[PDB]
């Protein structure tokens with residue numbers, strides 16, 4: 001099947017959301033949150049393995065997939081259709097931004113503050129961008145877009161999408177750099 005940002009993937013007892021399709025030389029996969037699974041973790045739908053994961057400290061990872069699935073430059077818009085990712089030009093503080101994830105679909109907000117530190121129960125994570133968008137469990141790893149420009153993957157936050165909350169993302173460019181990944185674009 002097509003790898004599409006915002007769609008679910010599974011491992012053991014858990015669900016996270018695909019971030020962005022990526023390539024590493026001849027290999028393919030998708031960016032995600034580090035906390036979704038440590039290096040070597042097997043995943044299903046799509047079949048893959050966590051090829052890299054830095055969490056805590058950062059919250060960045062990627063999953064290498066198999067020939068049974070195909071990378072796309074697409075993100076699920078959760079209204080029947082998709083958004084095409086054309087690059088990863090970083091949006092400014094104050095910009096609108098939207099995220100996609102398997103539990104709450106498409107949700108939007110504003111980028112409030114960058115380089116934020118959050119003391120998660122598993123350990124402290126730095127370098128995060130705080131937004132006013134909401135998220136819920138299952139949405140983690142999912143992509144953030146300002147227009148057609150990739151911003152990050154969902155790391156954490158508080159509250160929910162019924163009553164609202166705040167949400168943190170791991171910026172995408174540090175993730176691509178750390179793991180030596182190329183973003184799949186259209």
Ligand SMILES: *S(=O)(=O)c1ccc(CCN)cc1
Nearest residue numbers: 135137139140154155156159
């Ligand atoms: S995960 O990083 O999308 C995530 C986001 C938000 C929550 C809200 C829990 N209070 C949980 C998991």
